[PDB]
Target: Periplasmic substrate-binding transport protein
Amino acid sequence: ITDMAGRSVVIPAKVERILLGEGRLFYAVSLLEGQKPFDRIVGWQGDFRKLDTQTYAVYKAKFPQVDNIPLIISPEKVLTLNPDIAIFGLKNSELVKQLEKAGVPVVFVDFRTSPLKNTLPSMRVLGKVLHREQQANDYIKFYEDNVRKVTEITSKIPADKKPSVFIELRAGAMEECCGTAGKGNMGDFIDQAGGNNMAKNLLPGALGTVNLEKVLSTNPDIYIASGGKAPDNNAPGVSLGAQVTKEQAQSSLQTILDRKGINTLSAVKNGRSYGIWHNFYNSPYNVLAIQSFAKWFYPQQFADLDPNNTMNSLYSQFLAIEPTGTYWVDS
Ligand SMILES: [Fe+3]
Model:
């Protein structure tokens, strides 16, 4: 193996005990664990349980054991869990040092900073080091095919024909507005879906913030807000995920679109304004976002493309729960 930090690592002999240093790495692991999702997970960081309460609650009702997975508990205690392997994303510098001095192998994967470069390499690696190469090679082919449906068209489109796009990540509460993605993160999706991300040249990094005045002045063709907020939660933000209905999503999206300034945007007035589930920013399920983006960017060329079909297929083929809720929405 060569991991996403360029480190060389040795495939364990056996793996029955996996440590998830970033909780949302569960999403990648879920694609390899078939009907037994939590069986080999001895502990995890609590971002999956605390930030994706919706997906979690759906997993709990079919697997109540999940509440007893330890949350990364002193570092020392976690070493007692005797992990065969620890997976981390590109704060956890101490936990990593201890694990390495315990002769535990550590793998760094990535689906957040450089998703285009790394989503599939990340899956290929997890395939090998977790003894699930077929399920990985399967998801990879399924991902590639569902992305080719888009790139076959968008790869050939010249820059001057492409719509301008601004994506506001975690839109909501705009005393602090215009958090977005630049040369990476969801900008990779915009790139692949044949969009022109207005923030690509404003930002040095994958993630960052932009001034509202800069969005108003560019006045992009397309506006996207991301969110993963539960419906019953009067906090501001777009409400999407496994327990959100179409009607809850539109209602919450509309609240976001009606903020001072944002509501004057041409893209808002022309109804080229959309919502995407935030967690696609760190997940190999991101193919769904790429497809949602293409469909928004070029509605007719992708008229028959339905991300809901791809999602139902992904769940059918790889997961152990039923798809529910709303992961994207239109004005
Ligand atoms: Fe985040």
User: Anything to note?
Assistant: The first strand starts at residue 18 and ends at 20. Residues 161 and 194 are 9 Å apart (CA to CA).
